[PDB]
Design a protein around this ligand. Structure first.
Ligand SMILES: [Cu+2]
Length: 154
């Protein structure tokens, strides 16, 4: 039930997609509003620390999403040498080297490692129920060393 469908994007296409995130930054939180919201996350953008996810040009920010919203997530793997995944779970940190995060409520399989000047990305839709969730990478050791962020659906 994980999303294992990866589309190819060049760097300009990646940038264009990153700019489509509909959240507003305050502090270290990205707040979304409206009936449908579009989260665009990337794994380790240039200039950002490994390992981390970036959303709206912030490092592992907390995503604030309205209860009742349909969440369209775009996940892009911009990180050379790694096939990061993006999985949403109720299980919080700290994470084991091999995270035990079932059930995964929405998310992806492992992404392709970047190649041919191209990056893998994917889109999935999530209809969350109010609560605190986390977006996590399951590549061994990544979540244990900080590759995760929080989602507050309220
Ligand atoms: Cu990772």
């Amino acid at each position: 039930t994980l999303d294992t469908t990866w589309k190819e994007a060049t760097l300009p296409q990646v940038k264009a997609m990153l700019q489509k995130d509909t959240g507003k930054v305050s502090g270290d939180t990205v707040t979304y509003s409206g009936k449908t919201v579009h989260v665009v996350a990337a794994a380790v953008l240039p200039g950002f620390p490994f390992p981390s996810f970036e959303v709206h040009d912030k490092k592992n920010p907390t995503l604030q999403i309205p209860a009742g919203a349909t969440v369209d997530v775009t996940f892009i793997n911009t990180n050379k040498g790694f096939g990061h995944d993006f999985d949403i779970t109720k299980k919080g940190p700290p994470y084991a080297v091999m995270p035990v995060i079932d059930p995964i409520v929405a998310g992806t399989g492992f992404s392709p490692v970047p190649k041919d000047g191209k990056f893998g990305y994917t889109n999935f839709t999530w209809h969350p129920t109010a609560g605190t969730y986390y977006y996590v990478c399951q590549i061994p050791g990544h979540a244990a060393t900080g590759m995760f962020g929080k989602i507050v659906v309220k």
